[PDB]
Amino acid sequence: PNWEFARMIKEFRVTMECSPLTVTDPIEEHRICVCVRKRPLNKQELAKKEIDVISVPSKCLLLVHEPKLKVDLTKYLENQAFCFDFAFDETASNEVVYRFTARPLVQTIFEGGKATCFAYGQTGSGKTHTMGGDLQNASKGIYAMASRDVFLLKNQPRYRNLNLEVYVTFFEIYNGKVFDLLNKKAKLRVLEDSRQQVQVVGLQEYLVTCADDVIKMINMGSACRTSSRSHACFQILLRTKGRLHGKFSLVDLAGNERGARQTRMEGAEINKSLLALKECIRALGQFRESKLTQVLRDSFIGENSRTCMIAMISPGISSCEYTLNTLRYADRVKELS
C-alpha cells in the first residue's frame, strides 16, 4: 500500500472533527496538545494595506490563502489547510484561549503532575500578549489566569487536605545563560548531576498566597527585563512540606525566524533549542540538548506529564512565508501523538 500517506491522512481526518471533549477527556490522557491562534491585523499593518491571508472556518481548522503567481504572472491562491486540537481566530480572547490550552493542565499539578505550556511562533505574532498579558496587563494573560485558578483549586475540599504552599519562579534564557527576573537578572548556573537531573542554582522561588501577589511578581519580572532573541519561563510550584508536589512551567519562547550576517548568531542557539524542544515534546509520547530543554527536562521525562503548544500566527500577506514555517513546526509536533 501507500500506508504512510493513509496514516497521515487519517491523523488529519481524526483531528479535523474533534469535540472539545478530547483534550479535556478523563481516562484517555491527551499528553500533547497543539493549538494555533490567529491574531488580528493591527493598525500599522492595515495602514500598510496588508491583506489578511488567514481564515479559521472551524474550531479545529485553519486555512492559509497562499498568494501565488503562475509562471505567466497570473495571480492565484493555493489554499492550504491545517487542522489542530484548537484553532482560535482573530476574535478569540486570552480567556477563551486559556480555557482550552493551559487551564486543563492546571488540574494536572494538583494531581502530582508536571505541566508545560509553550507559546511558539514568529516575532510580533502574540506570544507574550497571550502569556504575559495585553501589550502591560499581567492579569489578562495566561501566567496570571493559570495562577487565579491554582488558588481556586486549593480552596476546593478535594485539594485542601494537601497542606500546600504556592511558589513562583520567573526567568529568562538568552544565549545559553539563565537569568532570574525576580532577582535583578542575576546570572544563574545550571548543574546536571550523575543521575542527569538539573538544578538552577539560586533561582528565587517566591512564596505567594493570593492571585494579586502573583500579578505583582509577573509585573516585576516583565519590568525587570528591558524583545525576542530570548525565552521566558514563568513557573508555578506547589510544595507541601517544602517537598515539590506539582509544577507548571509556562514559556514565552523566542522568535522562530532566525535560521540566521556574522556574530548575531544567537539564531544558532535559538534554532538548536526549538529543534530540541520539538524532540523533547515527542519523547513525552514514548538530543542536541539546549539550555531550555535542560532546565525543563523534568517536565518531559515524568510519568504524569502533560504539555501544550500554542502556535501564534501573523495573518498579514507579508508574513505568509513565516506563517507557513510556524505551521510546519506545529504540524511536526502534533505528528507524534
Ligand SMILES: Nc1ncnc2c1ncn2[C@@H]1O[C@H](COP(=O)(O)OP(=O)(O)O)[C@@H](O)[C@H]1O
Ligand atoms: N490577539 C491579539 N489581539 C490584539 N492584539 C494583539 C493580539 N496578539 C498580539 N497583539 C499585539 O501585537 C503586539 C505584538 O505582540 P507580542 O505578543 O509582543 O509579539 P511576540 O509574541 O512576537 O512577542 C503587541 O502589542 C500585542 O499587544
Ligand SMILES: [Mg+2]
Ligand atoms: Mg510579545
